[PDB]
Symmetry: C2
């Protein structure tokens, strides 16, 4: 009886100690999670910016290709007209 | 001849049209080079932000492993409490 009470008190002390250490570690987990989520948010904000530069870069590349095509068509007309005039 | 004259005029119009296109291309290409620079700088920052994120994830997983060890301990204590309480209730 006495020994069982003694063991039980010892166990309940260890329970309360582990509970408390778990409260401290759960608080620490929380801060680390908040800091991870902050870093994730920063990466998402940067990503929005990155995508916008990518859309600019693509749009400008598309517009360069279109202008190059236009220039080639003009150049075909130019070479045709030069042939016509050289024959005269 | 009038035919040669018409061709020479057409060629002048096309030469101006090419010059105008060439210039448009140069202005587009200078903004394109800047967009590339901006994009590259954003990509380099994203690679940095990723490395940082992983370091925070490492801190968090360390702390989770410390939690898991305490939970194992606690479950061990609860197992012992059930036994010891059963024994005591019988006396």
């Amino acid at each position: 009886a006495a020994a069982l009470r003694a063991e039980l008190r010892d166990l309940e002390l260890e329970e309360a100690r582990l509970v408390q250490e778990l409260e401290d570690v759960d608080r620490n987990n929380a801060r680390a999670a908040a800091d991870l989520q902050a870093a994730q948010a920063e990466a998402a904000e940067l990503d929005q910016q990155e995508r916008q530069h990518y859309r600019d870069y693509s749009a400008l590349k598309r517009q360069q290709l279109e202008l190059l095509d236009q220039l080639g068509n003009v150049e075909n007309q130019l070479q045709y007209a030069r042939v016509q005039l050289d024959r005269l």
